[PDB]
């Protein structure tokens, strides 16, 4: 099992920002993905982070913590720049930005808007029929701050100016874990504990395809045009679906399977890969905490691949 | 007049035209509609008052149900606290939502949002002469209860279609009835002692089990030995229970291969 | 109490039989009396009838 | 402590407290002042060690008189809590007699200690 | 003295005081027969039956 | 009845919790510990002998483990899991005691000092195969080291220039304790007491800003101890007798800084308050050192006798609040005492805890982790909720 | 420096004297016919 | 439900009536002086006339009994029956017996009081029906043949049910079973209602206050390591510590002081209830022993504070009250006594508040800081407030006197405090 609690790749695959535990603190860190180690701890065990996301004009991380704050934290400088807050001490479960517009859900069902250029709160609101929340995503249609997608155990496409639910998809039997928009209309979703990804149209509510993998998933990464989606599975393998929006008619099996076996016969796990156009950034824990990488050529390797180290 | 904070709950008192109001902060204010005034106020600070009720058996008690999970009985003939009651319903699902007396009767009925419903009887007083100043704490009584989260697995215990087993998602196993709901009871996770003469396995502190994925059930030799078995979330073994004694059986079975258990079944 | 008072009688007795500088005021005498007395009280204060 | 006649030195105190530790290991001693005088009267004691740390010293120095009558060796040690922790009892004892068993496993160190005690009178 | 010996698990009761006003004898239609003092709490013969 | 010296009655009617339960205490609540288990620290990689020594890195999250199976592992430890980082294996030689060492000046040395029952100790350097050195040369005094079976590691500022360097300190055979040089390996001096050296511990005390003199305290096997400073040459500056105590077996000082929690800045040194000498009859005397300064025959502030058999390992909390007694003889033989009020913690070490035949115990420097290594070849890891 | 301030705060804390089961069963012998101030400083003697 | 239960109800409801000669002799041989074979032949006028002599002796030693010789010990009271009248009259006679018993609870070392109260034991049947006022009015004399006689005569009410193995047994019950009787809180509420009725009638005396104090400190000692039971047991002992402090006698005053100090050392209370208990024990200080006892409880009760605020400023509305009831003088003499009880945290909060709220008598803070020993974070905190004081007002000579004292001892601490705030050159330029 992983001692990396949670990790996030930067866009265009250069730096992995990962938070692990180190004697009831939270060793956060940034690692280049071609030696960066002097990165911070927070104070005590009751201040652990809950979500994190990149922002690419400087480059920085946002850490949605559990005490009730968001921490805008630089990377070149080591200190935290700003501490966004709500008025409540409730646990932020997910954060997502779009340009300047930031949006964080709570654990007490609220929604908060923010902006990382004005550094203040905008709207502080809840809605009915969303009784838990653990994912949200602002949709890409340019500067479309409207029509965001919240997700917990069923997915609710909700407006920001009509301010109510406009469509409701069936989710899973578990709380959702991965929800990401891959086109201007399609979004992939998948809970934890189950091996089933389902992609949804945003305008019809019809489950177009179901992707399957040989295990339950941990994190997905799609390309820039939704033609390759690589998930990392809980048994430490990498499953890449090539061209997942064509027509083996309703439920696509996994195409590429990369797992990493060292030259003594010991399987090492893979967490949080990243696939842009024709590369693959496989990451794995060599020692107990310090991760290593590999830039694998993606489209030319065979259907299965035991990477030796 | 304009009240300083949001009066979130109310109930009409059995004395003539006074109404009890509970604020968002901890103040019970007793408004008097005839005089247009307030009569008294009592404070339960840094706590959210969620329900009010009044005892109507001749004696005068008040019952605040505060949404931190707590339930207090005030006595208005002495402005005192008879007894508190800590964590009837859990705070996360809302705490005590509605907790009423019954008209003339010294029993209260409490229900939260975590699928519990209990009733609590006041004893008659223990000192024969003084009486109404030594009031016993309220005893537990009949209760009904679900398990606050949607169930993960469903089984039917007997061939009679009488009792079902629900494996929940709050890491709890319950036996529910189908005829009339008097016997909905949790199977207690007090592990039996290992038969070697030595102490038990597992946690000494009563934390509940892992999440319960898949179970299996038959009625072939009930009561003579362990009846049902189950398999938990990412747990290296699969453990049994007993349908008759309604608790965990002795022997867990390891899978002896260092893997998670996913599919249990039993011979008929 | 006969055993504990015999033991304290042995203490006091051999002290004031073997010392050659005492002031004959009975100091460890009434000290041992106080110790025997609260020993007696804290052993009679038990009640072997289950209350 | 002027009436405390012979009390041992540092090294002799250490070696007799290690031999009384081994005596308590092998269960070959009787501890306490009244038990010491009992075993002295019935005449089994190899030697007597006594602690010159109690608020009367006359609680123990009555057994020197019959100890001199019966020619047994006897020696003082400056710490009764040391006697307790070396004899294996959670209370501070005063005196300890070592009983006689020629079929022991510590006979030779007991006898060497006995000579080192009877040499200083 | 103004008693109420309210019993519900046996049927519609029936009274007979003694010749002097001391003892009481009650009878349920289900099976209950109780002969008892009533100014003193001295239940001296209770008997259930099944007829 | 109404239409509306009474102070505490009115506020009894106001509130209904009656302890300052929160983080506004900064002290351990006596006679009631608050402690949770964690995952087994030896789960990702099994051991094979008795865990003879545990330690922590004084800044990094590394728990170092070594035993009689002639290997030494170093885990990276946290709550849900813990993994192995490296695991060096020395053939031929067991390791009776092995410990971290970071230099005080540069904080970029990270040596491991591992010694067994043989004559050599091994020095590992850590900067991320890997090399080691074999300290095996007593210079002038070879007939005074039967073995390197017990050692300690301590800093020293050299008192005419501030060249702070480390020192290992060895148990002798007659009455000796040699010190050495941690980096080079020169002899520096050897002090000596009479009887048998049984154990010893290292005090520090500051003198001015950025300047400190260390003190080696060493016990007899009888109970009179010698404390001599060694920032000058090692001659005795005080010698005092334990009030009682005969067969004493371990001594540990601390409360300030010591081997289980050193500093990294030089001026973060601190004079150790509590001292704890523990016998073989189960008894533990503990003194303060603000009334036992020049008394030359001080009184025990506490005389615990709570555990029965012969004690081996007694450690402190890194801020000096919780002593840990641990006797390596019988099963389930560890206790924790609340040190300022010298009470004994009642609720935790109960029979529903799988301590086993405890043979090493070690505190974390800042997380409040508590590692206990037993004889069966594992180490369990509790966490104290207060720290 | 703040860690040194907090560690000095928790070092500067003297030995309290607790209460336990039979801490005051000795009062029931000299309970009878004693002035209240003598009982009070006797209790303060048992505490301190 | 159970007919046997519904009949035992009327049995205990009509125990105080005689319906044959055997029950009459069983209800009449219960007497407080004589045994059965003599008390079973006593006509009522005999015990009435010797009890009238007993009441006259008690009246000429105590002047509040002529009202009873008028009313309840009258000549017609030998023909007044108990259970033939109406319930309003039985309630009036009930609290008449209650008034008599808690008036004559302090006289039970006297044969006149025994022979006086024997009459209404024999006639008004208070050995059966007004039972608990008798029991917990004469509970304090538990090592006495009069209490063994009371306990053999009476039947036990269900609260006192752990005395029931001392009926017909010639050993008097023990201190440990008295504490086991005081342990369960549903006896404790009843005893506290008795105690505050006795307070408001103002009959509190130095034997039953002693007994109540020793029972409360042993109950607290029994629950010393039971956090839940102590948390449930605070608002009984504390609430009647309050309405015992609201009285006037020095005995009950320092008895409340004793239960307060033992409860504060039993568990660490909250800072606000320590402050309010200090205001309560300080707003009603009258006598001489009350001063010394209140000072000792303030010092110890304020010392037991392990957490921040423990050396903070005590507020003004209680600080000027402390300055009123206690002078700054004789605080010096309590400090100058030899045994020196531990008072460091209260002395520190006293110094911080005399620095921040009076700022005109600093020779006093110099003197008491010179004559007490002090701990290091406390002296750092008071010199931090002293630097705040020295930069809010002008540097007078007594201010620089105690500052040069704080220079002459602990140079490193005052320099570290000034390194936290500025520079010693600017400080010396100020002074």
Q: Where do the domains of chain D lie, and which CATH numbers do they carry?
A: 1-121 (3.30.1330.30)
Q: How far is CA F201 from the centre of its chain?
A: 9
Burial of G47 per CB tally in 10 Å (0-12, 13-18, 19+): buried
Which residues in C lie closer than 8 A to residue H174 (C-beta atoms)? Answer: 44-47
Does an H or E element contain D21, and which? helix D10-26
How far, rounded to the nearest angstrom, does the alpha carbon of residue F356 sit from its chain's CA centroid?
20
- Phi-psi map region of F107: left, alpha, beta (phi>0 left; psi -120 to 50 alpha): left
CB-side neighbour CA atoms (13 Å) of A46 = 7
CB atoms under 10 Å from CB of B77, counted, come to 11
For A134, the token pair is 């653990």
- Measure CB to CB from residue C18 to each of D34, D55, D62 and give the nearest one: D62
Decide if A186 contacts A245 (C-beta within 8 A): yes
**Residue found under tokens 């032949």:** H41
Please report residues of H whose CB lies closer than 8 A to that of G40: 254, 257-258, 293, 296
DSSP F208: E
User: Chain H 128-187, CB below 8 Å of chain B: which residues?
Assistant: 130-133, 157-159, 186
Distance CA F373, CA F53 (A): 8
Nearest to F79 among A2, A21, A288 (CB): A21
Block residue for tokens 């006289």: H107
Note whether A22 contacts F78, CB cutoff 8 Å: yes
* Subunits in contact with chain D (3 or more CB pairs closer than 8 Å): C, F
Q: Which helix (H) or strand (E) holds H90?
A: helix H87-103
Supply H8's token pair: 């035992």
Q: How far is CA A3 from the centre of its chain?
A: 18
Contact residues, F window 321-350, toward B, CB-based 8 Å cutoff: 350
Nearest to D81 among F195, F224, F244 (CB): F244
Distances (CA, A) of C48 to H151, H205, H215, H222: 19, 33, 21, 19
Q: What is d(CA F110, CA F125) in angstroms, rounded to the nearest whole number?
A: 6
Q: Alpha-carbon distance H112 to H141, whole Å?
A: 16
Whether chain C has a CB inside 8 Å of the CB on H6: the answer is: no
Which 3 state secondary structure label does DSSP give H279?
Answer: helix
- C-alpha distance from F387 to closest chain D C-alpha (Å): 34
Q: Given an 8 Å threshold on Cβ–Cβ distance, is H222 in contact with G5?
A: no
Q: How was this structure determined?
A: cryo-EM
For the beta carbon of residue B216, count every other beta carbon within 10 angstroms.
18
Largest CA distance in chain C: 52
Nearest residue to F117 (alpha-carbon basis) of F52, F201, F166 = F52
Report yes or no: F61 at the A interface, CB cutoff 8 Å: yes
Inter-CA distances, A45 with A22, A95, F367, Å: 10, 21, 9
* Structure tokens, B186: 């949790």
Strands B139-145 and B116-121: antiparallel
Q: What is the largest CA-CA distance in chain B?
A: 78
How many whole angstroms separate alpha carbon D37 and alpha carbon D39? 5
Q: What is the DSSP letter of B94?
A: T
* Contact call for residues B53 and B35 (beta carbons, < 8 A): no
Cβ contact G20–H375 (<8 Å): no
Q: Which of H183, H227, H287, H296 to mutate to test the interface with G (most CBs of G within 10 A)?
A: H296
| CA distance, residue D44 to nearest chain C CA (Å) | 22
Altogether, the residues listed in chain A come to a count of: 309
Q: Which DSSP symbol is given to F108?
A: -
Tally the C-alpha atoms within 13 A of residue D62's C-alpha that lie toward its C-beta. Answer: 22
Residue corresponding to tokens 């009688």? C9
Q: Please count the helices (runs of H) and the strands (runs of E) in chain B.
A: 0, 21
H3/E3 CB distance under 8 A: no
**Backbone φ, ψ for residue F167 (5° rounding):** -150, 130
The set of long-range contacts for D8-12, using a CB threshold of 8 Å and a minimum separation of 24, is: D8/D75, D8/D76, D8/D77, D10/F222, D10/F224, D11/F195, D12/D116
The gap between the terminal CA atoms of chain C, to the nearest Å, is 25
**Secondary structure (3-state) at D51:** strand
Determine how β-strand A69-74 pairs with β-strand A60-65.
Answer: antiparallel
With an 8 Å Cβ cutoff, is B130 touching chain H? yes
User: Which token pair is F97?
Assistant: 């005691």
Work out the angle at residue F275's Cα, subtended by the Cα atoms of residues F270 and F276, and round it to the nearest 5 degrees: 145
Among H318, H334, H337, H324, smallest CA distance to H280 is for: H318
Q: Can you read off the two tokens belonging to residue F94?
A: 């067991």
Our CA dihedral for F292, F297, F302, F304, rounded to 10 degrees, sits at: 140
> Which residues have a Cβ under 8 Å from the Cβ of H81 and sit 6 or more positions away?
none
User: With an 8 Å Cβ cutoff, are H6 and E42 in contact?
Assistant: no
Q: What is the resolution of this structure in A?
A: 6.0
Question: Torsion angle of alpha carbons G9, G10, G12, G16, nearest 10°?
Answer: 140
F126 neighbourhood in chain A, CB within 8 Å: none
DSSP annotation of H76: G
Interface membership of H22 toward G (CB under 8 Å) = no
Distance in angstroms (rounded) separating the CA atoms of residues F284 and F327: 11
Determine which helix (DSSP H) or strand (DSSP E) holds D25, and give its type and residue range. Answer: helix D10-26
Q: Hey, what are B109's tokens?
A: 């009925």
Q: Which long-range contacts (CB under 8 A, 24 or more apart) does C5-12 make?
A: C5/C36, C7/D34, C8/C32, C8/C33, C8/C35, C8/C36, C10/D34, C11/D56, C11/D59
Q: Any chain A CB within 8 A of the CB of F39? A: no
Q: How far, in Å, CA of D7 to CA of D77, rounded?
A: 6
Chain length of chain B: 268
- The answer to whether F and G touch (≥3 CB pairs < 8 Å) is yes
Nearest to D23 by CA among D111, D94, D90: D111
Q: Which two tokens stand for residue F85?
A: 């980082």
* H-helix segments, chain F: 7-14
Q: Which residues of H touch G37 (CB under 8 A)?
A: 254, 289, 292-293
User: What's the Cα-to-Cα distance from H347 to each of A289, H283, H372, rounded to whole Å?
Assistant: 52, 20, 9
Interface of H with B in 272-311 (CB under 8 A): none
- Token pair, residue F42, equals 């030896």
Question: Which element (helix H / strand E) includes H88?
Answer: helix H87-103
Neighbours of D30 (CB within 10 A): 18
Q: Are B169 and B242 in contact (CB under 8 A)?
A: no
Q: What are phi and psi of H257, to 5 degrees?
A: -60, -40
Task: Output the CA torsion sign for H131, H132, H134, H135.
Answer: positive
For F306, the closest chain D residue by CA position comes to D90
Distance CA A222, CA A188 (A): 10
Which chain C residues have a beta carbon less than 8 Å from that of G29? Answer: 37-38, 41
DSSP H161: G
Q: Is residue A217 within 8 Å of residue A233, measured between CB atoms? A: yes
- Strand, helix or coil for residue A31: strand
Closest CA to H16 of H140, H152, H147, H120: H120
Residues 6+ apart with CB under 8 A from A196: A172, A190, A210, A211, A212
| Touching subunits for chain C (3+ Cβ pairs under 8 A) | D, G, H
- Among G23, G30, G45, pick the best mutation site for testing chain H contact (most H Cβ within 10 A): G23
d(CA H85, CA B259): 84
User: In chain H, positions 145-184, which contact chain C (CB-CB < 8 Å)?
Assistant: 162, 165, 173-177, 180
First to last CA, chain D: 18
| Contacts with C, G 6-45, CB within 8 Å | 25-26, 28-29
Separation of alpha carbons F360 and F42, rounded Å? 14
> Are the C-beta atoms of residues A267 and A258 closer than 8 Å to each other?
no
């Amino acid at each position: 099992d992983s001692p990396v609690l949670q990790s996030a790749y930067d866009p265009s695959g250069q730096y992995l920002c990962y938070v692990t535990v180190a004697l009831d603190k939270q060793r956060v860190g940034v690692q280049p993905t071609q030696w960066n180690e002097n990165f911070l701890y927070l104070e005590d065990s009751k201040l652990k982070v809950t979500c994190l996301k990149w922002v690419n004009d400087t480059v920085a991380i946002i850490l949605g913590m559990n005490n009730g704050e968001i921490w805008l934290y630089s990377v070149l400088a080591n200190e935290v720049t700003y501490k966004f807050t709500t008025g409540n001490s409730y646990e932020i479960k997910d954060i997502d930005l779009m340009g300047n517009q930031l949006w964080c859900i709570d654990s007490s069902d609220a929604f908060y808007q923010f902006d990382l250029l004005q550094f203040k709160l905008l709207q502080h609101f809840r809605i009915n029929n969303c009784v838990q929340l653990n994912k949200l995503t602002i949709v890409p249609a340019g500067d479309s701050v409207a029509q965001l997608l919240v997700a917990s155990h069923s997915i609710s496409l909700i407006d920001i100016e009509e301010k109510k639910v406009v469509m409701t998809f069936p989710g899973h039997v578990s709380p959702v874990s991965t929800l990401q928009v891959i086109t201007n209309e399609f979004f992939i979703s998948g809970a934890e504990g189950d091996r089933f990804l389902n992609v949804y149209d945003i305008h019809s509510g019809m489950t177009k395809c179901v992707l399957v993998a040989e295990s339950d998933i941990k994190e997905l990464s799609h390309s820039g045009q939704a033609d390759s989606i690589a998930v990392t599975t809980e048994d430490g393998s990498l499953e890449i679906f090539v061209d997942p929006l064509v027509s083996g008619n309703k439920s696509k099996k996994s195409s590429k399977k990369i797992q990493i076996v060292s030259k003594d016969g010991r399987k090492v796990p893979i967490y949080n890969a990243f696939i842009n156009k024709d590369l693959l950034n496989v990451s794995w824990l060599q020692n107990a905490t310090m991760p290593y990488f590999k830039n694998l050529q993606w489209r030319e390797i065979p259907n299965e691949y035991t990477v030796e180290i | 007049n304009e009240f300083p904070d949001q009066i979130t709950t109310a109930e009409p008192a059995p004395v003539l035209d006074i109404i009890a109001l509970g604020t968002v902060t901890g103040e019970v204010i007793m408004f008097n509609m005839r005089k247009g005034k307030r009569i008294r106020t009592i404070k339960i600070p840094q706590s959210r008052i969620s329900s009010l009720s009044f005892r109507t058996d001749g004696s005068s008690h008040l019952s605040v149900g505060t949404s931190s999970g707590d339930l207090i009985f005030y006595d208005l003939d002495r402005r005192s606290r008879i007894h508190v009651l800590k964590n009837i319903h859990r705070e996360s699902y809302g705490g005590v939502t509605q907790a009423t007396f019954l008209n003339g009767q010294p029993i209260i009925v409490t229900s939260g949002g975590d699928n519990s419903l209990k009733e609590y009887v006041f004893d008659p007083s223990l000192s024969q002469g003084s009486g109404d100043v030594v009031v016993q704490p309220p005893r537990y009584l009949r209760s009904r209860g679900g398990h606050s989260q949607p169930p993960s697995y469903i089984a039917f215990a007997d061939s009679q279609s009488h009792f079902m087993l629900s494996a929940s998602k709050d890491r709890s196993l319950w036996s529910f009835s189908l005829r009339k709901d008097a016997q909905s009871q949790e199977m207690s996770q007090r592990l039996h002692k290992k038969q070697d003469g030595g102490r038990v396995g597992g946690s000494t502190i009563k934390s509940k089990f892992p999440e319960i994925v898949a179970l299996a059930i038959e009625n072939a030799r009930i009561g003579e030995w362990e009846n049902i078995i189950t398999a938990h979330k990412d747990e290296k073994f699969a453990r049994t229970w007993d349908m008759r004694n309604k608790r965990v059986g002795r022997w867990t079975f390891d899978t002896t291969d260092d893997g998670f258990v996913k599919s249990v079944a039993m011979s008929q | 109490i006969a055993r504990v008072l015999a033991a304290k009688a042995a203490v006091s007795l051999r002290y004031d039989a073997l010392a050659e500088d005492r002031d004959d005021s009975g100091d460890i005498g009434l000290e041992s009396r106080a110790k025997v007395e609260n020993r007696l009280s804290q052993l009679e204060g038990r009640d072997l009838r289950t209350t | 402590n002027p009436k405390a006649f012979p009390l041992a030195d540092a090294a002799l105190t250490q070696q007799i407290l290690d031999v009384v530790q081994q005596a308590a290991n092998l269960r070959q001693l009787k501890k306490g002042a009244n038990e010491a005088t009992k075993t002295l009267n019935r005449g089994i004691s190899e030697f007597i060690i006594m602690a010159a740390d109690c608020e009367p010293i006359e609680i123990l120095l009555h057994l020197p008189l019959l100890c001199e009558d019966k020619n047994v060796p006897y020696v003082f040690v400056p710490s009764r809590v040391a006697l307790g922790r070396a004899c294996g009892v959670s209370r501070p004892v005063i005196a300890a007699s070592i009983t006689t068993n020629d079929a022991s496993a510590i006979k030779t160190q007991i006898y060497a200690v006995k000579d080192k005690i009877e040499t200083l009178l | 003295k103004a008693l109420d010996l309210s019993l519900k698990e046996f049927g519609p009761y029936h009274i007979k005081y003694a010749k002097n006003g001391t003892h009481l004898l009650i009878t349920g239609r289900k099976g209950h027969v109780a002969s008892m003092d009533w100014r003193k709490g001295q239940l001296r013969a209770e008997l259930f039956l099944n007829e | 009845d109404e239409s509306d010296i009474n102070a505490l009655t009115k506020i009894l009617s106001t509130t209904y919790n009656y302890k300052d339960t929160l983080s506004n205490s900064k002290l351990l609540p006596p006679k009631k510990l608050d402690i949770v288990r964690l995952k087994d620290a030896n789960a990702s990689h099994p051991s094979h002998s008795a865990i003879q020594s545990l330690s922590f890195h004084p800044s990094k999250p590394l728990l170092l483990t070594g035993g009689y199976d002639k290997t030494l592992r170093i885990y990276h430890i946290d709550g849900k899991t813990n993994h192995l980082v490296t695991s060096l294996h020395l053939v031929g030689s067991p390791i009776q005691t092995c410990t971290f060492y970071t230099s005080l000046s540069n904080q970029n040395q990270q040596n491991i000092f591992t010694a067994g029952r043989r004559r050599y100790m091994h020095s590992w350097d850590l900067s991320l195969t890997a090399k080691i050195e074999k300290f095996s040369r007593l210079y002038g005094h070879e007939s005074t080291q039967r073995s390197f079976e017990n050692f300690k590691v301590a800093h020293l500022q050299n008192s005419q220039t501030n060249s702070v360097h480390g020192i290992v300190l060895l148990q002798g055979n007659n009455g000796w304790i040699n010190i050495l040089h941690s980096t080079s390996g020169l002899w520096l001096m050897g002090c000596k007491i009479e009887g048998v050296i049984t154990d010893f511990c290292i005090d520090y005390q500051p003198i001015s800003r950025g300047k400190f003199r260390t003190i080696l305290i060493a016990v007899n096997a009888y109970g009179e101890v010698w404390e001599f400073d060694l920032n000058k040459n090692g001659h005795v500056i005080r010698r005092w007798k334990d009030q009682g105590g005969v067969g004493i077996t371990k001594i540990q000082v601390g409360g300030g800084t010591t081997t289980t929690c050193p500093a990294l800045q030089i001026s973060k040194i601190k004079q150790n308050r509590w001292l704890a000498v523990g016998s073989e009859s189960g008894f533990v005397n503990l003194y303060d050192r603000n009334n036992a300064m020049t008394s030359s025959t001080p009184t025990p502030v506490a005389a615990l006798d709570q555990l029965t058999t012969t004690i081996s390992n007694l450690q402190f909390s890194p801020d000096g609040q919780i002593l840990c007694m641990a006797s390596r003889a019988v099963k389930d033989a560890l206790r924790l005492v609340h040190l300022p009020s010298c009470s004994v913690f009642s609720n935790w070490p109960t029979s529903g805890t799988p301590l086993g035949k405890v043979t090493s115990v070690a505190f974390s420097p800042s997380g409040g982790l508590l590692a206990v290594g037993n004889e069966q070849g594992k180490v369990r890891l509790w966490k104290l909720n207060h720290y | 420096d703040e860690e040194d301030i907090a560690l000095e705060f928790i070092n500067g804390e003297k030995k309290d004297k607790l209460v336990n089961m039979n801490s005051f069963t000795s009062m029931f012998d000299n309970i009878q016919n004693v002035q209240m101030d003598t009982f009070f400083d006797r209790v303060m003697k048992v505490l301190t | 439900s159970s007919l046997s239960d519904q009949l035992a109800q009327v049995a205990s409801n009509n125990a105080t009536v005689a319906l044959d000669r055997k029950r009459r002799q069983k209800l009449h041989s219960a007497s407080l002086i004589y045994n059965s074979k003599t008390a079973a032949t006593q006509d009522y006028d005999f015990i009435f006339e010797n009890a009238s002599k007993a009441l006259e002796e008690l009246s000429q030693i105590e002047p509040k009994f002529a009202i009873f010789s008028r009313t309840l010990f009258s000549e017609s009271s030998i023909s007044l029956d108990r259970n033939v009248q109406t319930k309003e009259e039985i309630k009036d006679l009930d609290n008449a017996i209650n008034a008599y018993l808690l008036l004559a609870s302090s006289k039970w070392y006297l044969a006149p009081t025994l022979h006086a109260t024997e009459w209404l034991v024999r006639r008004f049947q208070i050995h059966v029906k007004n039972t608990e006022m008798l029991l917990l009015s004469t509970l304090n004399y538990y090592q006495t043949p009069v209490f063994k006689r009371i306990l053999s005569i009476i039947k036990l009410p269900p609260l006192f049910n752990c005395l029931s193995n001392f009926v017909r047994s010639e050993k008097p019950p023990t201190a440990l079973t008295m504490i086991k009787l005081f342990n369960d809180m549903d006896f404790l509420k009843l005893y506290t209602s008795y105690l505050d009725q006795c307070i408001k009638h103002n009959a509190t005396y130095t034997n039953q206050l002693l007994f109540t104090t020793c029972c409360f400190i042993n109950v607290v000692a029994f629950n010393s390591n039971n956090d839940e039971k102590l948390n449930q047991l605070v608002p009984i002992l504390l609430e009647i510590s309050a309405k015992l402090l609201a009285s006037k006698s020095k005995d009950c005053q320092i008895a409340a002081h004793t239960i307060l100090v033992v409860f504060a050392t039993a568990l660490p209370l909250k800072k606000t209830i320590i402050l309010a208990a200090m205001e309560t024990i300080l707003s009603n200080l009258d006598a001489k022993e009350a001063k010394h006892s209140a000072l000792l409880t303030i010092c110890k009760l304020f010392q037991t504070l392990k957490g921040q605020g423990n050396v903070d400023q005590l507020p003004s509305k209680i600080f000027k009250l402390f300055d009123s009831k206690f002078d700054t003088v004789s605080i010096l003499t309590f400090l100058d006594k030899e045994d020196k009880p531990v008072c460091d945290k209260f002395i520190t909060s006293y110094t911080r508040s005399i620095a921040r709220y009076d700022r005109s008598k600093l020779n006093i803070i110099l003197s008491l800081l010179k004559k007490i020993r002090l701990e290091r974070y406390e002296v750092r905190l008071i010199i931090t407030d002293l630097i705040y004081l020295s930069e809010i007002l002008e540097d007078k000579s007594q201010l620089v006197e105690l500052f040069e004292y704080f220079i002459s001892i602990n140079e490193d601490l005052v320099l570290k405090c000034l390194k936290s705030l500025g520079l010693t050159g600017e400080l010396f330029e100020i002074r």
